[PDB]
């Protein structure tokens, strides 16, 4: 049973899916789990009290958003459950579970437990032939056609860097945070009420994402735009509402270099790309350097790659050729390389079978991701 | 002492018993 | 036992009555009960001496009119029991009470005490077998076939804007005044003493109602009005002798809009409009403006739909979609989504049996209407 | 020029002024705004026409209240000059603004620009020789005499739990809600017009929270009181007209615990206070569990502690020592700790002075406050 297999690109803000050997993910739609807010009086309303993707982006407002996933750690597996159910129902894919084998994506140093209850639901819940756990940062060189490399991404959830020479991943070398697109928003939203705008409310938490994507830019000079004053530029809601942002939009993404800011004492993007560089051996450090792939939504922002680089230049040692490259597709960068992963002759030998998860169990499924 | 409002009888505190 | 259920939309200035799945009701009449001031000397006179409905109307002037029921809150309800003995006698409906369930209506954020006694009336003078309350906001959405919109209502009792979204109406953005067509009619009568036409009997009222009625209009600028001098319209009274309104006819029904003319400080009507949508969620507020239902008499005065529209620009965001939709049949609009909602299905589930109601008592009722 | 400094305890409910080195403050009053309804057309009335402090609490029935400050965030700038006018005027304090330093207190994460608009008004309108502006707990803690604690505050306008230790107030840590006193005044009011007896008016609203502060209680368990039946306790309006409150009474304050009875989702109070202590560091977190103190008004609820002992024993891990302070001195704690703070040598280096306002501006007042 050989069938064009399924990837599923998990993460804690967006969940792309779709089918392998295409181009580009068509079926991408956000991680979370909305519930009413409002008692249903009258008849004809919205059926089925649990709405996921489309239906819950278009009715944001009477839907209490949760979600299930933060920084690539799953906490209530019921609404997972139902995601991966809404995936595979009419609505978006139009297929069933039985027929094709899934490749799943995990963020790196999670917890195995976590890893397991995934496996489980897939094989048991799901009757699902064969399932494949890989990484996003091996991933997203398949999508750019490359084998060497260090992948710097940024998701919703995890930062991390893996640095991989010519099909070598370290897991030693590897650096990660919890601090990305998610805390970004939260840390951009508490700076909105100190401005005076407040978005308290679950669904109105989503404006604030849609703030943090549109109307913000990294300053390259931090000390510079402090001693200066903002011109207050300003961005019209849903609603239709006016509101000066202030020097909230440039101090929010900040965090990712500063996560002292937040209160929680950790590197920072710059300096995990720089300690997964030092970490490694000594003679593939300058390979390392000289190529550097960008990925997920939180690299999207204005001058990032400019800051990027120029923390580079201060930290690494002098006379050292630095080069940032950064795909047009980078939120789609690491589902595409799972469609290419998916596509190749020597998937069928990298996957877990339902055959060999009922004889062993948790130990193969260990064993074949590393 | 003087002024409006007061608690007579809440106590300072509701503290949970010690245990070895 | 399941026939053809009785509707009975019960109202302050009018009562309107008749059976599920009409068109229109059969059985309009004003909800009072006329008593005779006069001795009764020669024979072959009116008997019973207790009036309701088109008698009533015929025999004004013998009659001492009064209203039972005030800003939707009954107090003599000893009339309401007479009323509603009325409408299932063989004057008007010409059916018993215990073969037909019953459909009531009743505003919203009523006393408790006054839904209890209206179920007790039903339930045990009249042997009911199934009752059931409900709102104006959602059935006037069924009679109109949507789903969606505000619905602003002015009746004679109360006026009151129910935001409802795709079938889910929100309890806590539920506004609501005292000040509806029977404050705006007691207001005119006032201005007509200051003009010199003073009235005071309780039969002589119901021609301050026809004044009301047929020469009133709302100005979009009052301020421009009130510098202008007026040309004093005439107006032929049921006697014979004419009337000169002046600015009396206008400046009544800016009660509504203006409440601190009567000498309540509250919203008005435009306000109530505007704080119903803005006490609900951001992404729900545009959908809400486009959709605005009017309903009840007191929507009924020349410029009223005009100078809505001018305080929602005022107030509401700039650059928004205002549309302020009605049906032809404004007054008929509760009684119809109420015919329609008798003659669904799903009718049998959400009504009170009268066997739940002798096993448990107020509590199934209050857990059934909300 | 170091003159006795004053006071001022701001509040969206209760203003409190004075001297510093006290006992307990002098002045206390209501933090409003009265200005006359009606028409003074007999000659000797009372003159001014704008009232606050005792005045206005004798006088209500005339005067349209209005609160300037909501949720410790003055909307009406010119209300809250002319209470600051008022406080210093010879019918209070009987002194100069230009002798005395101030002592102002704001909520924290409050709007810098209401902040920087404070200041501005106490240098420039007033003439304050030297401003400093200060926290709740801090203040709360100072009266005490501890420097450990976390300080569960519950005023008019907000709630929030600042987790301080030894001295060391943690900023990131701070949890924050706009659901407080006014709110439960106000959900205490729609009950009462769903048991009967409606109140609409502004200086009617605060019969409502003399309702508040007299009749109500919070149940141990809130299920058991709903399945049981309540008693009908009694209250005595100015009027001399009976009350019934009936059930009203002990669901109001469940607002500070289930803040969805609103239609709000937040943490709620006992969340709050919990999320204060987590967000804190791992081994800080017994120390701030055993030195819970308590402060504001929406604090004296009948078995408030007791219930929020409760709520903290079924969120924390096991086997801990809760220990929730509450000193006599409850609603002034906050004014003592300023006093105390005030009477301290230190209080000369923390203060911004006006000539130092005069040379940086804002800047220099966002840096001295953190
Ligand atoms: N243009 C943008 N600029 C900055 N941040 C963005 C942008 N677009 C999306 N984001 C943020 O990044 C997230 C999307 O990144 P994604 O790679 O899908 O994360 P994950 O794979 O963990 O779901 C969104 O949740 C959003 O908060
Ligand atoms: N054409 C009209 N113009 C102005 N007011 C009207 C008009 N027709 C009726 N009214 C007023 O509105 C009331 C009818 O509204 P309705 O919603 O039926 O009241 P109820 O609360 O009794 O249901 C009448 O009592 C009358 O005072
Ligand atoms: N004994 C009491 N019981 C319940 N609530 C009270 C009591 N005393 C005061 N309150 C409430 O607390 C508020 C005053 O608290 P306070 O701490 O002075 O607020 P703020 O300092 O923000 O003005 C009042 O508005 C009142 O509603």
């Not at chain 1, 998990?10 to 079926?27: E, H, L, R, T, W």
């Not at chain 1, 930062?159 to 601090?179: K, L, N, Q, W």
């Not at chain 1, 401005?195 to 830019?217: L, P, Q, T, W």
């Amino acid at each position: 049973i050989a069938n064009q297999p399924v990837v599923i690109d998990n993460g804690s803000g967006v969940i792309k899916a779709g089918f392998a050997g295409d181009q580009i993910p068509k079926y991408c739609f956000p991680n979370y789990v909305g519930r009413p807010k409002h008692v249903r009086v009258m008849a004809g309303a919205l059926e089925g009290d649990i709405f996921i993707g489309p239906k819950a982006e278009e009715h944001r407002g009477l839907l209490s958003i949760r979600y299930p996933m933060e920084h690539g750690i799953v906490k209530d597996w019921n609404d997972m459950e139902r995601i991966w159910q809404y995936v595979y129902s009419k609505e978006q894919l139009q297929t069933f579970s039985e027929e094709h084998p899934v490749l799943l994506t995990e963020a790196p140093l999670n917890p195995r437990k976590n890893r397991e209850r995934a496996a489980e639901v897939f094989f048991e819940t799901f009757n699902v032939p064969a399932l494949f756990i890989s990484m996003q940062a091996v991933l997203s060189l398949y999508a750019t056609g490359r084998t060497t490399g260090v992948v710097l991404d940024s998701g919703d959830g995890v930062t991390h860097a893996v640095p991989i020479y010519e099909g070598f991943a370290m897991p030693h070398s590897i650096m990660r945070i919890d601090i990305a697109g998610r805390d970004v928003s939260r840390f951009l939203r508490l700076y909105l009420r100190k401005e005076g705008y407040d978005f308290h409310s679950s669904s109105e938490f989503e404006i604030v994402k849609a703030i943090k994507e549109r109307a913000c830019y990294l300053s390259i000079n931090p000390q510079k735009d402090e001693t200066l004053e903002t011109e207050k530029a300003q961005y019209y809601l849903p609603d239709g509402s006016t509101i000066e942002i202030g020097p909230s939009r440039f101090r929010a993404p900040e965090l990712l270099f500063r996560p002292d800011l937040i209160g929680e004492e950790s590197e920072g993007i710059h300096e995990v790309l720089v300690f997964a560089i030092q970490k490694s051996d000594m003679d593939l450090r300058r390979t390392l350097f000289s190529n550097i792939v960008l990925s997920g939504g939180s690299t999207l922002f204005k001058g990032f790659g400019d800051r990027l680089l120029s923390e580079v230049k201060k930290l690494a040692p002098k006379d050292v050729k630095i080069r940032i490259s950064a795909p047009q597709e980078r939120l789609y960068s690491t589902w595409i390389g799972g469609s290419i992963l998916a596509s190749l002759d020597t998937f069928k030998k990298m996957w877990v079978s339902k055959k060999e998860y009922e004889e062993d169990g948790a130990r193969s499924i260990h064993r074949k991701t590393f | 002492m003087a002024d409006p409002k007061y608690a007579d009888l809440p106590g300072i505190a509701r503290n949970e018993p010690d245990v070895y």
